[PDB]
Short mmCIF file of N, CA, C and O in Angstrom, two decimals:
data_model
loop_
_atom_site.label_atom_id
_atom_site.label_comp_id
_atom_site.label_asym_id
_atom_site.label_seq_id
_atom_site.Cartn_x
_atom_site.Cartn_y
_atom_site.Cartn_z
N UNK A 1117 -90.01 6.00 -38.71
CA UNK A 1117 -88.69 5.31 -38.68
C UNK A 1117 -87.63 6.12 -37.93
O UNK A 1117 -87.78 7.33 -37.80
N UNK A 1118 -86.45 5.44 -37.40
CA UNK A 1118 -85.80 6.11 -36.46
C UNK A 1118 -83.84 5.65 -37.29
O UNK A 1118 -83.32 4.54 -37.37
N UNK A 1119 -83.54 6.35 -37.53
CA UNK A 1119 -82.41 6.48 -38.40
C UNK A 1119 -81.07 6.19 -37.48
O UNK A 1119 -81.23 6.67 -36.35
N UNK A 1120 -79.97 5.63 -37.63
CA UNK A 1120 -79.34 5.40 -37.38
C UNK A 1120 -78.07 6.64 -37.32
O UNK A 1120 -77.60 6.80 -38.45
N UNK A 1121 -77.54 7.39 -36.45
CA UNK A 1121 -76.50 8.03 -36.87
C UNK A 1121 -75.89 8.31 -37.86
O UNK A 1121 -76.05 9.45 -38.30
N UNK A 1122 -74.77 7.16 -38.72
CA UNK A 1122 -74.75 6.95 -39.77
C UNK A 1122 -75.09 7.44 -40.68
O UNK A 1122 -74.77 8.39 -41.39
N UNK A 1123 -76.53 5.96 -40.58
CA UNK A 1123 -77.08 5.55 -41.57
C UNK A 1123 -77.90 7.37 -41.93
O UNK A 1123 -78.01 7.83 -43.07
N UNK A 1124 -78.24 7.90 -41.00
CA UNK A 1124 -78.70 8.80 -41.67
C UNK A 1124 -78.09 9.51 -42.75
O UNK A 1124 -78.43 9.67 -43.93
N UNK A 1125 -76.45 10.16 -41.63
CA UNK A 1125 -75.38 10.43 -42.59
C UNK A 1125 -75.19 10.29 -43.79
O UNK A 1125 -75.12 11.29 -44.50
N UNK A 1126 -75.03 8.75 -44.42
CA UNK A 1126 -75.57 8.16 -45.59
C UNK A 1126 -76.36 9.02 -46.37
O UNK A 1126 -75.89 9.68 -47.30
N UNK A 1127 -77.73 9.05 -45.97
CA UNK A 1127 -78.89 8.93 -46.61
C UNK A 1127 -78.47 10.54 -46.76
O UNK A 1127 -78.22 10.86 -47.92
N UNK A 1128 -78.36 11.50 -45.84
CA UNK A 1128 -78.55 13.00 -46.68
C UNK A 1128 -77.11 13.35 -47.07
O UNK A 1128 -76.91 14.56 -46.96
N UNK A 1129 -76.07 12.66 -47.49
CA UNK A 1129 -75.13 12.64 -48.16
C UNK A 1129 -75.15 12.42 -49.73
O UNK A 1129 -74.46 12.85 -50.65
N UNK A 1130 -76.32 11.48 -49.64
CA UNK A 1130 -76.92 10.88 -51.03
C UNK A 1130 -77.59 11.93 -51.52
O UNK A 1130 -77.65 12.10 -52.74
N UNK A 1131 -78.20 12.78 -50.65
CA UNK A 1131 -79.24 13.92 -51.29
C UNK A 1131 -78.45 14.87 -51.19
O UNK A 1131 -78.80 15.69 -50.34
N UNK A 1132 -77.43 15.11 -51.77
CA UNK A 1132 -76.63 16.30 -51.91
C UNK A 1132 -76.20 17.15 -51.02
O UNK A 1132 -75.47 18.03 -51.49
N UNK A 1133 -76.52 17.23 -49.29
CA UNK A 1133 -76.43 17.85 -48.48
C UNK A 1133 -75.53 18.48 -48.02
O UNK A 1133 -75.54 19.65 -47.61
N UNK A 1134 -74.01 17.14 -48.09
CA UNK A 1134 -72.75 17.53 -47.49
C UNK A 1134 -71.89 18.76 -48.38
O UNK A 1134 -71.28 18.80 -49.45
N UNK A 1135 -72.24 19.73 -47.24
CA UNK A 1135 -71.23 21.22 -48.06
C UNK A 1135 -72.29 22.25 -48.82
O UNK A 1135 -72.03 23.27 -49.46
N UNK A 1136 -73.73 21.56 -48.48
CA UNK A 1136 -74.90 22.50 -49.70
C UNK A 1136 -74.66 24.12 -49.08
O UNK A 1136 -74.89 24.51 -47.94
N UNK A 1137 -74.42 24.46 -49.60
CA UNK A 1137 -74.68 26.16 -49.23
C UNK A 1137 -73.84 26.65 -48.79
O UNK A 1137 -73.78 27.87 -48.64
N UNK A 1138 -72.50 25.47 -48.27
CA UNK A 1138 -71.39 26.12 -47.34
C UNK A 1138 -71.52 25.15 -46.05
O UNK A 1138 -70.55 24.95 -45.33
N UNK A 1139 -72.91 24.50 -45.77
CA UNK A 1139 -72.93 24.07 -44.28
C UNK A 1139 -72.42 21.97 -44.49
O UNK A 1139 -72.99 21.04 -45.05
N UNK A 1140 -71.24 22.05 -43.76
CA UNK A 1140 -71.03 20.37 -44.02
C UNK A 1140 -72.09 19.70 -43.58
O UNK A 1140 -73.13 20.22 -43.19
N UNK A 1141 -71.74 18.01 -43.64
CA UNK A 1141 -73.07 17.10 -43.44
C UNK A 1141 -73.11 16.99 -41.92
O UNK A 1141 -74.06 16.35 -41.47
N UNK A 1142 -72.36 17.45 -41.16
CA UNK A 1142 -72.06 17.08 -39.90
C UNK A 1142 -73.26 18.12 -39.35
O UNK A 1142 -74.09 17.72 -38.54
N UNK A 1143 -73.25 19.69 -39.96
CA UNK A 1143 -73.95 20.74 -39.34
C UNK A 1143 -75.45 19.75 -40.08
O UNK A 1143 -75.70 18.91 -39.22
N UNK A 1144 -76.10 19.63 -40.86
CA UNK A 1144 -77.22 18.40 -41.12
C UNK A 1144 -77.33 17.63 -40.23
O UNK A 1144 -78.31 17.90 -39.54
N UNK A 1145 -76.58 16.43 -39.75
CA UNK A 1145 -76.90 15.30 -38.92
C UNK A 1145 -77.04 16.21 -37.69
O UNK A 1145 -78.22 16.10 -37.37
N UNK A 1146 -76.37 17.15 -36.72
CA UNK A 1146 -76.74 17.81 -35.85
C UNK A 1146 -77.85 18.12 -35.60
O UNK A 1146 -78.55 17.92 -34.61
N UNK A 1147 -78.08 18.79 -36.87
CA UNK A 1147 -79.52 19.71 -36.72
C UNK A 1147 -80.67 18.50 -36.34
O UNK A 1147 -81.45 18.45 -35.39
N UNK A 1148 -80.48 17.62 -37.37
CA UNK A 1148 -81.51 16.60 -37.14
C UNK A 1148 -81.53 16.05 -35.78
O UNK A 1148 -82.50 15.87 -35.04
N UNK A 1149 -80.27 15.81 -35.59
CA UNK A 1149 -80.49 14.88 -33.46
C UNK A 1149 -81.14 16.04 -33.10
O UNK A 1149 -82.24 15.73 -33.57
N UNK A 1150 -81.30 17.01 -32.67
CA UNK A 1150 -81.92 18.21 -31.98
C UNK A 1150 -83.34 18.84 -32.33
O UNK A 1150 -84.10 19.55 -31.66
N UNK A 1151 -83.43 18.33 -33.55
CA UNK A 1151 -84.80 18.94 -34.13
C UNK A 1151 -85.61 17.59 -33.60
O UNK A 1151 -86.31 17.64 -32.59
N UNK A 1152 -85.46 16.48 -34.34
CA UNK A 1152 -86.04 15.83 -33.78
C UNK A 1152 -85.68 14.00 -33.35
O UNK A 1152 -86.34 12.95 -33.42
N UNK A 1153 -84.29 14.37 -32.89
CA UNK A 1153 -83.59 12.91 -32.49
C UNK A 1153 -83.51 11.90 -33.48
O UNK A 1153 -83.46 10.70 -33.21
N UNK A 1154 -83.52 12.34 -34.58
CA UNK A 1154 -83.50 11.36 -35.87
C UNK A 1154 -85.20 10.54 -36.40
O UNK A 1154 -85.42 9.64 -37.22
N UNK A 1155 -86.02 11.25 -35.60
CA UNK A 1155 -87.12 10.36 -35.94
C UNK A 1155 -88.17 11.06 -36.94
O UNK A 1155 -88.72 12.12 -36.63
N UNK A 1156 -88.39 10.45 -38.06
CA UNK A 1156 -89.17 10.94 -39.21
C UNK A 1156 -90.58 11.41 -38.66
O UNK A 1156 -91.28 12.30 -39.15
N UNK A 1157 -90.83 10.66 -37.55
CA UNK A 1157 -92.74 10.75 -37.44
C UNK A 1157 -92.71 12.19 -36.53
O UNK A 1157 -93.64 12.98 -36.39
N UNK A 1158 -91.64 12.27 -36.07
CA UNK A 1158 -91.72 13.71 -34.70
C UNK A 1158 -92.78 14.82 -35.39
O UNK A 1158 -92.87 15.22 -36.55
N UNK A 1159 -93.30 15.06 -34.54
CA UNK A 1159 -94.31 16.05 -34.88
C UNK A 1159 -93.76 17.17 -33.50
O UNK A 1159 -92.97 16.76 -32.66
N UNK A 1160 -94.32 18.63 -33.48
CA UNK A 1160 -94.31 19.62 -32.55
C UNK A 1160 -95.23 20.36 -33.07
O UNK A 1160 -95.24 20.84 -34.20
N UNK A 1161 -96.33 20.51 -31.86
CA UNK A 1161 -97.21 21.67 -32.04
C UNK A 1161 -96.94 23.22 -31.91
O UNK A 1161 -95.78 22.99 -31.58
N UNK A 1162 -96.99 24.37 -31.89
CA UNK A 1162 -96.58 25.20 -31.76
C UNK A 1162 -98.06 26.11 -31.30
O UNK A 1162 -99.07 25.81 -31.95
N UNK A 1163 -98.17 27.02 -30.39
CA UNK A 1163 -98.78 27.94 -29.78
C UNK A 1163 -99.00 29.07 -30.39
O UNK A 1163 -99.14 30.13 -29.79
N UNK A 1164 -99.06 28.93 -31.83
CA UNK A 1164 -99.29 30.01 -33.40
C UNK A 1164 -100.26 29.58 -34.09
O UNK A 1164 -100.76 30.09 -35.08
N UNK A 1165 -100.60 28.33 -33.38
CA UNK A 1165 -101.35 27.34 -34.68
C UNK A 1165 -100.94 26.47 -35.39
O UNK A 1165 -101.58 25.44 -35.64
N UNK A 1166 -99.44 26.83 -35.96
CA UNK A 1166 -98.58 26.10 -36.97
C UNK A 1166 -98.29 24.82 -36.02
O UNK A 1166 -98.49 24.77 -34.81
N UNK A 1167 -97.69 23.65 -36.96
CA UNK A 1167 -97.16 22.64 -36.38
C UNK A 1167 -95.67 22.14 -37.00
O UNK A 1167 -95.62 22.26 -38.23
N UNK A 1168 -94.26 21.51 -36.27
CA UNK A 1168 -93.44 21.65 -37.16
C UNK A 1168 -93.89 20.11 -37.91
O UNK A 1168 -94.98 19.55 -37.74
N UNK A 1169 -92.48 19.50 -38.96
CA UNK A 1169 -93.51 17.93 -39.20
C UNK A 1169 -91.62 17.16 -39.66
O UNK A 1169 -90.54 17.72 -39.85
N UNK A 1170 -91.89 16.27 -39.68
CA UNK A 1170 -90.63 15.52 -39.96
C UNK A 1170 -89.29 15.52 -39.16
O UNK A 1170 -89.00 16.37 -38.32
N UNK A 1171 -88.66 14.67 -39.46
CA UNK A 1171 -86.62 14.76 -39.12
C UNK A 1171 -86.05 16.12 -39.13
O UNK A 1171 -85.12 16.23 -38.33
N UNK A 1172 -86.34 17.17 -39.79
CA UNK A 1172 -85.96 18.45 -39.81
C UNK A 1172 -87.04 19.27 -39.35
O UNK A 1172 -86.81 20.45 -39.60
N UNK A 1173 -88.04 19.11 -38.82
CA UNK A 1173 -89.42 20.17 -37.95
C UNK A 1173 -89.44 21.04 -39.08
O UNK A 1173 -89.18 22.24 -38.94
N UNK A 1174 -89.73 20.55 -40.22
CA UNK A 1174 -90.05 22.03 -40.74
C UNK A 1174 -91.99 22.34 -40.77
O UNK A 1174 -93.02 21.68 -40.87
N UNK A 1175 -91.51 23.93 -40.58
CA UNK A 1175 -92.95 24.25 -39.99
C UNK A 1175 -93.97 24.64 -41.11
O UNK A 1175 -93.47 25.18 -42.10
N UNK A 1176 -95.36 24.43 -41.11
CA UNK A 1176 -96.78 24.23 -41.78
C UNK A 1176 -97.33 25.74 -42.00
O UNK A 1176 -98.39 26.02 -42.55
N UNK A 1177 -96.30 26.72 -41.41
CA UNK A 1177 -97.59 28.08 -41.76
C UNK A 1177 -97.06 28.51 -42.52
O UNK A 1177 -97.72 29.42 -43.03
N UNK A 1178 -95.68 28.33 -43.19
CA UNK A 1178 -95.04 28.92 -44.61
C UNK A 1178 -94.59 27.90 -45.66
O UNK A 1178 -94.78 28.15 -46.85
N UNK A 1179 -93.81 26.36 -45.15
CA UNK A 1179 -93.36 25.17 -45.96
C UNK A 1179 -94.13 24.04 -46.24
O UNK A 1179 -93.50 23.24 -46.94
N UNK A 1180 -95.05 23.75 -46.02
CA UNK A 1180 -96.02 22.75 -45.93
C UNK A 1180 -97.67 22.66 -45.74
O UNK A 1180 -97.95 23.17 -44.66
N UNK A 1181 -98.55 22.30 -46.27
CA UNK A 1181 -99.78 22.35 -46.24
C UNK A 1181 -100.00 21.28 -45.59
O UNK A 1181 -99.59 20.20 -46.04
N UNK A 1182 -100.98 21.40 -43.87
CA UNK A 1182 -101.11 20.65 -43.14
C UNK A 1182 -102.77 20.81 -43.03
O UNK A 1182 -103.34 19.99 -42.32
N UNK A 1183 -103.51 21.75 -43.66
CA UNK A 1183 -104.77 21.95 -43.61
C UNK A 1183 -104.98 22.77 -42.62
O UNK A 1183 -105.58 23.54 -43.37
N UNK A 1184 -105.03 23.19 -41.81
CA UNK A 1184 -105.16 23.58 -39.92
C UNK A 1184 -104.20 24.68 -39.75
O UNK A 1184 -103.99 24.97 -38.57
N UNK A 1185 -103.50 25.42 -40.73
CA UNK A 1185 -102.51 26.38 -40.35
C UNK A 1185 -103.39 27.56 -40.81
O UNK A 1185 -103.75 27.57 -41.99
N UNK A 1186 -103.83 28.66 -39.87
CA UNK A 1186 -104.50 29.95 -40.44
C UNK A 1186 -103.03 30.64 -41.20
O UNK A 1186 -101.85 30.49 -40.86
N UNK A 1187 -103.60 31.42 -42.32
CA UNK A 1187 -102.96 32.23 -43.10
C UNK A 1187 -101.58 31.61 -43.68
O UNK A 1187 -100.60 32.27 -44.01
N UNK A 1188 -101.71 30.15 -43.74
CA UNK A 1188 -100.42 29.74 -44.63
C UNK A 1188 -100.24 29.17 -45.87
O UNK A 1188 -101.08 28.76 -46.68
N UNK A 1189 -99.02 29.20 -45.91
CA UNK A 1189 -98.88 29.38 -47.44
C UNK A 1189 -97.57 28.09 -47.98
O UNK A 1189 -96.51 28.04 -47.37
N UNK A 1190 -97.83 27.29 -48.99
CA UNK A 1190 -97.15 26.42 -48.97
C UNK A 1190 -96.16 26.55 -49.97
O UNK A 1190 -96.42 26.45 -51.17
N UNK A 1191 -95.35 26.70 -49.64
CA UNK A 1191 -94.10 27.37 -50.51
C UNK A 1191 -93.17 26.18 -50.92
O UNK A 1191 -92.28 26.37 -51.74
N UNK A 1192 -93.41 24.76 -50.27
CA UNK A 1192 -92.56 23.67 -50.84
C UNK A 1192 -93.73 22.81 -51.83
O UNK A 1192 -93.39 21.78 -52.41
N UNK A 1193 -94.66 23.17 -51.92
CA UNK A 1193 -95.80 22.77 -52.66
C UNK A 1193 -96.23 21.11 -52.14
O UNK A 1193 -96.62 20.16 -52.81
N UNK A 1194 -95.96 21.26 -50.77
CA UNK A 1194 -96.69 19.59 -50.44
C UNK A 1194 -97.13 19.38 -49.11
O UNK A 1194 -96.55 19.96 -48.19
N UNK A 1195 -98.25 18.47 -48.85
CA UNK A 1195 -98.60 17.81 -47.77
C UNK A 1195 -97.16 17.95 -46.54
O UNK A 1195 -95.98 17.76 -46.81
N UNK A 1196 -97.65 18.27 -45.47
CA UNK A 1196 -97.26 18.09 -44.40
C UNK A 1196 -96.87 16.48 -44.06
O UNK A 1196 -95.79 16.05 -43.67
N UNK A 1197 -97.90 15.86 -44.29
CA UNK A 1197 -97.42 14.09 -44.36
C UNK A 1197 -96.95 13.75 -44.65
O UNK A 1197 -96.55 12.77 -44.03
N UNK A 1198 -96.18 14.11 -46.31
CA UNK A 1198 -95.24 13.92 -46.68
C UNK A 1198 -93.79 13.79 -46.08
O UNK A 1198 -93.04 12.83 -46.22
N UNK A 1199 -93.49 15.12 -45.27
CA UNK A 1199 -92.52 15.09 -44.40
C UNK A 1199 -92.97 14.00 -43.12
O UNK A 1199 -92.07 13.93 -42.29
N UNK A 1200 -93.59 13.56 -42.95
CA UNK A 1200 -93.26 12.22 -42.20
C UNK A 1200 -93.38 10.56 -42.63
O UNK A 1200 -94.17 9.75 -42.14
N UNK A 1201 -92.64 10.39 -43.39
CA UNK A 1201 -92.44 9.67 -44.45
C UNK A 1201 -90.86 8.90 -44.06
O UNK A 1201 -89.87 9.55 -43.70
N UNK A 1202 -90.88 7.27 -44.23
CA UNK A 1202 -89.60 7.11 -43.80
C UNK A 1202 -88.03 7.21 -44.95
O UNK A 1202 -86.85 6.88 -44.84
N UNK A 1203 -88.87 7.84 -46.00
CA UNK A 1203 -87.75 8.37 -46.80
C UNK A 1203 -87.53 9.93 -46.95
O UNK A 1203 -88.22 10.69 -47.65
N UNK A 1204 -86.62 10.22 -46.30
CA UNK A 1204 -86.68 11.44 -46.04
C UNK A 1204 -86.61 12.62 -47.51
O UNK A 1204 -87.11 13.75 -47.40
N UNK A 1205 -86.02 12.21 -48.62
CA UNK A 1205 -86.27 12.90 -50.32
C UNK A 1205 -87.14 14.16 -49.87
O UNK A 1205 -86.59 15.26 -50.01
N UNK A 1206 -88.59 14.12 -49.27
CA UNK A 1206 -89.25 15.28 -49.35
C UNK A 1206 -88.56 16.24 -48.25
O UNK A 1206 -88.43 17.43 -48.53
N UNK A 1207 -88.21 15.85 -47.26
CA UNK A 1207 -87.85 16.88 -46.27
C UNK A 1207 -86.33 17.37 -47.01
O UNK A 1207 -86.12 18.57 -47.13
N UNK A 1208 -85.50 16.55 -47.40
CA UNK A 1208 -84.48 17.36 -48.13
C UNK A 1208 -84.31 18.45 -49.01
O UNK A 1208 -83.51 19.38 -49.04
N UNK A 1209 -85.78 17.93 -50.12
CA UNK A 1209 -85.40 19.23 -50.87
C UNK A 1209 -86.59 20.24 -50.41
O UNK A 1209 -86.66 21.43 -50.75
N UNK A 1210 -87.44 19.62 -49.65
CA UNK A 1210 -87.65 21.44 -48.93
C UNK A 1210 -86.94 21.93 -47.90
O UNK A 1210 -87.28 23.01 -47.41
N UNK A 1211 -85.79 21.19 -47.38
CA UNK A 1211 -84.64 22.12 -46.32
C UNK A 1211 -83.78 22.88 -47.37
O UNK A 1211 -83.19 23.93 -47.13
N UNK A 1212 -83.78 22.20 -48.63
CA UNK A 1212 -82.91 22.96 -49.73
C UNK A 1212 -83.09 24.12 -49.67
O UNK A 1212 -82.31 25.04 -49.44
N UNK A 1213 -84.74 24.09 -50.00
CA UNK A 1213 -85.54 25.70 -50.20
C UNK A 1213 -85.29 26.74 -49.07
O UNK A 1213 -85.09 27.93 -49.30
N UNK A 1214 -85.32 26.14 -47.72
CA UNK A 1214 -85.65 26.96 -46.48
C UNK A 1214 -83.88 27.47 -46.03
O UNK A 1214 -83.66 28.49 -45.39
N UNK A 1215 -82.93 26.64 -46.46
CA UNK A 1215 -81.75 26.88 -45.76
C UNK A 1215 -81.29 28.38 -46.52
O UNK A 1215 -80.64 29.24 -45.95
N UNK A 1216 -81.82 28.47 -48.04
CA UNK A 1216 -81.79 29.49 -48.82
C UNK A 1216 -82.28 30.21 -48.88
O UNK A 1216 -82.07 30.95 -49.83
N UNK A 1217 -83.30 30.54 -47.89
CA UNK A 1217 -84.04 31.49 -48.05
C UNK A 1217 -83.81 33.09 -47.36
O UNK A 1217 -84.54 34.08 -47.33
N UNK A 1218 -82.61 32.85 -46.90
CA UNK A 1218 -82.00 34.09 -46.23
C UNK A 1218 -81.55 34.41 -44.76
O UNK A 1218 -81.17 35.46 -44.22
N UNK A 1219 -81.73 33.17 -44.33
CA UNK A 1219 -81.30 32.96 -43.06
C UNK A 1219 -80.14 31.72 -42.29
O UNK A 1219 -79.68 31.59 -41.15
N UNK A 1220 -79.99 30.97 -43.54
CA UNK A 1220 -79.03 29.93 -43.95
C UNK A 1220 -79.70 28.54 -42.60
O UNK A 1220 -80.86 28.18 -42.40
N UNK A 1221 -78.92 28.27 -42.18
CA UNK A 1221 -78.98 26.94 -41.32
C UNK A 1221 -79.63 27.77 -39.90
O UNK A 1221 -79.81 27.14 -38.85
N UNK A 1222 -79.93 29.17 -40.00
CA UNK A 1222 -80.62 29.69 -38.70
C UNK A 1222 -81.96 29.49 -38.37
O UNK A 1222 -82.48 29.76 -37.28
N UNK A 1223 -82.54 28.97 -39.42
CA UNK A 1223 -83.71 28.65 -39.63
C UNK A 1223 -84.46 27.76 -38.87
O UNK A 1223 -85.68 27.74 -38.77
N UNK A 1224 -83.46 26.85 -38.23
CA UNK A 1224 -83.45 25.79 -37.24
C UNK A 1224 -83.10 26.04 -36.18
O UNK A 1224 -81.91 26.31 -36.03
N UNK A 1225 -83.93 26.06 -35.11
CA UNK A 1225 -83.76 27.33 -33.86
C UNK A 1225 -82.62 25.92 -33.00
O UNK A 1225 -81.55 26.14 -32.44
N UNK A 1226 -83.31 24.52 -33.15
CA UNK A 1226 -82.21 23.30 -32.49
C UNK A 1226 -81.10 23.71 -32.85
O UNK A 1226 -80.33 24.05 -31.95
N UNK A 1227 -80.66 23.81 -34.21
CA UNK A 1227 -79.45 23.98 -34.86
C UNK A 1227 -78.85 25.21 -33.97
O UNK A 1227 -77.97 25.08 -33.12
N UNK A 1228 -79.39 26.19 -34.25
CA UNK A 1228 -78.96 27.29 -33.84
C UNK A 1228 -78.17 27.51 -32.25
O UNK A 1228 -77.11 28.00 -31.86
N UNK A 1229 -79.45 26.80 -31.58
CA UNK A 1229 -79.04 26.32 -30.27
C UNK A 1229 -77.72 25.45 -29.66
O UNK A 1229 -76.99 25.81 -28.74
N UNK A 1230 -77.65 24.32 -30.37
CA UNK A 1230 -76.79 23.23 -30.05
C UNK A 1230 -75.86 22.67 -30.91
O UNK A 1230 -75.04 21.80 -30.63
N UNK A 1231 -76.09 23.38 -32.33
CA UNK A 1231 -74.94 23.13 -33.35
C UNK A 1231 -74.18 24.21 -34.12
O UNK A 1231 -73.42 24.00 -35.06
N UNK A 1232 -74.54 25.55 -33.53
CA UNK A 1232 -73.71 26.56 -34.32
C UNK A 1232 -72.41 26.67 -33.53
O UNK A 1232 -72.30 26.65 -32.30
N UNK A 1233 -71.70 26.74 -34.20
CA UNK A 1233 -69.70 27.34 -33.47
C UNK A 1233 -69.52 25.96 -33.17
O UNK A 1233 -68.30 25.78 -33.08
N UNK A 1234 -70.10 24.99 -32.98
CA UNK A 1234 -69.41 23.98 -32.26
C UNK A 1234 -68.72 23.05 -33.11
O UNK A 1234 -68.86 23.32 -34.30
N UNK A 1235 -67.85 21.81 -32.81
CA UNK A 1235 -67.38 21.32 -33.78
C UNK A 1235 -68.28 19.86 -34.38
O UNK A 1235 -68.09 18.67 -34.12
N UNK A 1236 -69.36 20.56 -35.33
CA UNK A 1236 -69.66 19.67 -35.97
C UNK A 1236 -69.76 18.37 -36.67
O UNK A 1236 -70.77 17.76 -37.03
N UNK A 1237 -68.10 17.97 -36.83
CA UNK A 1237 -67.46 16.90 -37.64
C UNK A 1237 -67.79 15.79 -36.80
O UNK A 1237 -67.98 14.69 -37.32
N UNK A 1238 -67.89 16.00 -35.21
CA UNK A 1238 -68.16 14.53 -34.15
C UNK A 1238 -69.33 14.11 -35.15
O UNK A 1238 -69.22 13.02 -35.71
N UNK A 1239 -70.48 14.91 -35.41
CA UNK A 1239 -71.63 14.03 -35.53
C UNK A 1239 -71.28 13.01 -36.61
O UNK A 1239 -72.20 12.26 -36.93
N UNK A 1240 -70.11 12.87 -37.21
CA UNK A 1240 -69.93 12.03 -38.14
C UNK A 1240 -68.97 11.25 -38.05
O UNK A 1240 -68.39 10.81 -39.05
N UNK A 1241 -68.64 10.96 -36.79
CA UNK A 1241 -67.57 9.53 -36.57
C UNK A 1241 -67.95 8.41 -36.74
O UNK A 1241 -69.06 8.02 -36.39
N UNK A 1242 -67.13 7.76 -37.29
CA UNK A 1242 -67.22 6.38 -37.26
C UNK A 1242 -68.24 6.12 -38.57
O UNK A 1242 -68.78 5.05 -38.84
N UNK A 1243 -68.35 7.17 -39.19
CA UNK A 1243 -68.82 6.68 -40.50
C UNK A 1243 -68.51 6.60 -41.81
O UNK A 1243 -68.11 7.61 -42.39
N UNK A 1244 -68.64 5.39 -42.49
CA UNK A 1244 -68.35 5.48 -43.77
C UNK A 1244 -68.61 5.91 -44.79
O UNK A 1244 -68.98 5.17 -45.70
N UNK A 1245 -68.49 7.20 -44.95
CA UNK A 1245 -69.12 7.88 -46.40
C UNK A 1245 -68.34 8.19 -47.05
O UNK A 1245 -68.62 8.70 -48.14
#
């Protein structure tokens, strides 16, 4: 499924996102256009073995059990498939886990790239939340 600007907005507003840790919903909807343009099914292979999986790419050799990752370890305790799912619930609360884990919203190399310092709040015009 392919999310609407917004509508995404919405949806990880509902899952507690906006302001989690310090980072508004705007630095969220960012990350997501860049990770993977709003689309749940995006997959990325990676040249480690690992693969990333969902709306937020989170990656299979430490957050997710994809079967096919040498030496990983699943620290959100679920299927990789899961994160491609058109309700996003699973990828939220394992970005919960990962944004906390000591590297905050850096964790997301898109983010890092195309949504740090900048002014975040655009990604959320014109919406009603």
């Amino acid at each position: 499924k392919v999310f609407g600007r917004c509508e995404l907005a919405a949806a990880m507003k509902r899952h507690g996102l906006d302001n989690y840790r310090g980072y508004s919903l705007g630095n969220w909807v960012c990350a997501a256009k860049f990770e993977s343009n709003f689309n749940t099914q995006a997959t990325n292979r990676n040249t480690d073995g690992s693969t990333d999986y969902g709306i937020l790419q989170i990656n299979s050799r430490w957050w997710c059990n994809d079967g096919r990752t040498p030496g990983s370890r699943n620290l959100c305790n679920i299927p990789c498939s899961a994160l491609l799912s058109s309700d996003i619930t699973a990828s939220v609360n394992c970005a919960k886990k990962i944004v906390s884990d000591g590297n905050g919203m850096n964790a997301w190399v898109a983010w890092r790239n195309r949504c740090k310092g900048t002014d975040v709040q655009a990604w959320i015009r014109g919406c009603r939340l």
